[model samples]
Target: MNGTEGPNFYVPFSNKTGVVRSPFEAPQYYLAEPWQFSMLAAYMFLLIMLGFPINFLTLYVTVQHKKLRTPLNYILLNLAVADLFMVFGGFTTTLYTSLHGYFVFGPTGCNLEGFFATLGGEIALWSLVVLAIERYVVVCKPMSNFRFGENHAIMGVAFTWVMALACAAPPLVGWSRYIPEGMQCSCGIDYYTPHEETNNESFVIYMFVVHFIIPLIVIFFCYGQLVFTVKEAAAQQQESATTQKAEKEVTRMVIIMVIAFLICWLPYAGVAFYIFTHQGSDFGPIFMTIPAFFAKTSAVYNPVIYIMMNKQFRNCMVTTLCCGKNDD
Candidate 1:
């Protein structure tokens, strides 16, 4: 079998997997020289600095403090774990790409990055889905005591990775291959020429369904129902109690997260649709680059959003991270 080729002309030899050729040449973008590298480096640094601390604090609070280990917090702990994995898995490559605009990590690194990207991306998306479902059940089906318990959380987390594995395995198994350009390696439908025998119609459909459509539907419905419930509850309350205020805060938090997810994810989803349906037409360089950057930016912005907006979480994080320091 052919060992996979990376960006530029470099190739890595592996005894485990057969040989594979790279499909791309040099950068097709005008800013491909320094701009791309600088942007990726900036993003990588920002993500590492911001995402790691927030997620770590969230994870620490959920696990270390017994009082905080509620059913909902368990689910959140799992989400934090997934986000931590995602930031590390993705940003390291972003850092690498920033320095060298092609695949410098050899054949194994290509597969490894693709694996982490796919796995981490999938887990992050599905964790949100699970959160949405849990919220839906809590609000819509009010009688249900099914508050995302430990067992349920574990099962949900396991299912997420299972789905992640199922989705990522195909590319590694030779169904789809990584395309390398400059210092970046992208894993997506290869869009092989019609006569080349490995046309990418089906893979496109699968990615859309798994990564974009289903998650979008779930988030919209969940958030919509949540909004409705909150409005009704607020109208019914005679006096604004602390509990009611807390519920309202929760509602706002979920809405913000949903909005953030939509902003970060929509561009890539749109690009996916065009790529799948349009066939031979290329959407130029900028269209693809912007969306990909936003997709990466999602990881960077999520923690900041939560810490800034959510009072409870922000307080917890401040207390944990700041230790005994007073805001003098």
Candidate 2:
């Protein structure tokens, strides 16, 4: 069914055949075929298996060790929390609906799922922005008095969550109500608003600019300065092996973080822009669904990028997982 039908049209069914009887039939009663359900289940399994423990280890290691609890590491902890929220809040609900073949959670659940999902994603993006800016200040402007203290990091994280809440609030506050979108298994901002009068279209545009475009620009700018600064340092300190190694490590991280963010979110952002402009594209539900899934996979990757990539974090994770001698 299209946006002409209300969100609640998708009702739960009690069968395992999983086959849709007709192409034009609404997904109210039955949604995914057996193969689709299997695919979704496998995908969800991977997300949960990877997303949860890695993020949990990030928090656990950082919190348990005093030396690891630096200002920037605090921000990494917050990123882990946000990713966990996305896993539990968004992916779990997606798994449920996918298995059941309809929107089983009703209206309030749908709205809540959408809000939490948006909040988690926005927070993650802004956390990365905070990290990039902090790194820029430390590496590129070290002589300046731009101190990134723990208090500053705390406030930055608080601001990130507050802003995420603000963006998520628009849907709940009547800008655009949350509803099941593509595949009838996922709920999110109603990209498929039926009427122009509704603020859904405007909100989507606003979110795209605010959450995606602006953060991307800021991240690239910060990283660009960082790269330039590191290169300049490497040239001047060519004889110092320690300096060169540190610079290379930082540069590698910058590249990894930016590439990971782009790979996970760019496809989804492209699809969003297309839908915003075209309004009537004949792209199938799977087209929208796949990109959205990729976006969600960001939650699974942040720990790998921020924690596993770091030597200290890797050691901590290994020690904790083994429950053996404390190397540090």
Candidate 3:
């Protein structure tokens, strides 16, 4: 069949004046490799299967059990909600495009996907920042009158959502356009595309600094202070075995959380920075796909790190899943 007569066919490229381009200039989309398709399918399947249920369970347990309703768990619940949206609003559509081999969702769907993904990611990052600061205040400045009440926690969660939405809005508002990237199966803000009106380069730099670098510095500073405070407390209470054990456990968890954030986000940010600075560089699928995949996996890890690692959550989950039958 000819190009115009086939189920999968290309339309001639055209300019704004309705001038059709040459046939050779028409664009064609390609299917991904068998391995690429299979890997993406598998990874997204795991993300949906694991990320959704775990995050849902986290929200459910926290809301249902009175014992679980603390200021800290309120922040965790917000994180769970963010990850849940990431799985559904972002990864599910990403999986669909990967299997179909192109963005079948069109421009509106593309924008929505990009916006929700960015929103979720930013909310999660800010939630972690809030958690770090809360921990630092409790552990380091216990004598201070500055307390994080439930109302403050609620406001903090709301602020993160609003901030994320504000950051994600620019693409929709003409700062940049969301378009297919790397293999054409996924869509995000057009980082590499430089338009005279949009000024995407400046947008990228601004986003990198405000969304990533500054928050990262804040998190590291808070955690660093937390470590010193915990160590000092441990030294002062050297003979208190229970206190030392609890402090060490909290410290270890905080460190692991920081490491997880770094491992997941740094590569993605590094690639973005490189692309922003060295425009028009050709980074192949391997470079793009690996970091994107790694960053998406952060959604999967949040429930594991925040909820499943806690004994109380495990017990609560067991009771909820087993129809109120206690495991112990």
Candidate 4:
């Protein structure tokens, strides 16, 4: 109890750290508002319950409907697989946090959970980027003549995992050292500690390059070109205003996807940036918690958007969910 600070507004409890306290305290994004905690728990639970069934349906459709399977769909298949890992392996930790408190899993479980969650997230991010690139090529390039055959689909899926492995390898390797004590546990890239400086530096740079800057550039450019191509195609095929309207709708969907990616991720990226620059400091828990919620929310929202917004995916989902046994 020597290190136990009396209950503060943001951090209710303080446990002992083996190392000395740094000049700054980690920001608490939430000060433990009962309503906010309830909302977060509700959102996460709903997402897990809904997301698993929908993603499984997506996987089933991709496998069963041979005509539906394409290079693009394969990317989507991989995305669903990545999201499934997140829900199964990663979401459990979130549930544990809700029932208990922060870092409910011990250090070993924390490290393993963090590693799997990070890996799944990185894979999902790269898969979307790859999907965007593929879409741009299909829409804008004159390679309409080239076949997007089964071999191409397999290769694309294979390459996505390869890139994901490369990106996910670093954090899982040597940086996973942490010990759990009492009711609290530490996990993944102890960004607030000076001792974690080397790992933080590497992770910060890698994430900035791989996760934020590079993906943004790729998505923006691809969508920009896609919008241009849609306009060009519309100009060539001028029939009814309705046709032009549909083309614009396609362009809007691409734009929306890119916008969603940035909105969901920017908060976490901003926090990471602050931690890298400031190290240990007095930060608000509300800021930390909100971003964490948004990041997890994206996984849930992604599937919903795909089902609601994409015509082909919606049709596939409807077919899979609605058909009776005899109809099958």
* Maximum-lDDT candidate: 2
Cα lDDT listed for each candidate:
0.58, 0.69, 0.68, 0.57
Local accuracy of candidate 3 as per-residue lDDT tens digits, 64-87: 777876556677788888888888
lDDT of model number 2: 0.69
TM accuracy, model 1: 0.76
> What value of lDDT does candidate 3 attain over all alpha carbons?
0.68
Better-scoring candidate (lDDT), 1 or 3: 3
Runs in model 1 lying further than 4 Å from the true structure: 1-31, 142-148, 181-199, 231-241, 324-328
Q: Which is the leading candidate under TM-score?
A: 2
By descending lDDT, how would the candidates be arranged?
A: 2, 3, 1, 4
Global Cα lDDT for candidate 4: 0.57
What's every prediction's RMSD, in angstroms? 6.6, 4.6, 6.2, 6.0
The true-versus-predicted C-alpha distance at residue 165 of model 3, in Å, is: 1.6
**Candidate 4: stretches off by over 4 Å:** 1-42, 142-145, 175-188, 196-198, 232-252, 324-328
Per-residue lDDT of 240 in model 4 = 66
Candidate 2: list runs displaced more than 4 Å. 1-4, 7-32, 194-198, 233-244, 324-328
Return the candidate ranking by TM-score, descending.
Answer: 2, 3, 1, 4
Judge candidate 4 at residue 50 and give its lDDT.
76
- Compose the digit string of candidate 2's lDDT tens values, residues 1-328: 2223333322222224444322123343334356776577578768878999988878888876667755557777888898888778877877776666555666666776667777777887787788788777766655645577777888889989987987887878677767665565667776654454557777887888888889889998987787787667535534366754754565466558677877877887777677667654455556666777667777778778866467777777778777867533
lDDT score for residue 260 of model 3: 83
Q: How do the predictions measure up, each by TM-score?
A: 0.76, 0.85, 0.83, 0.76
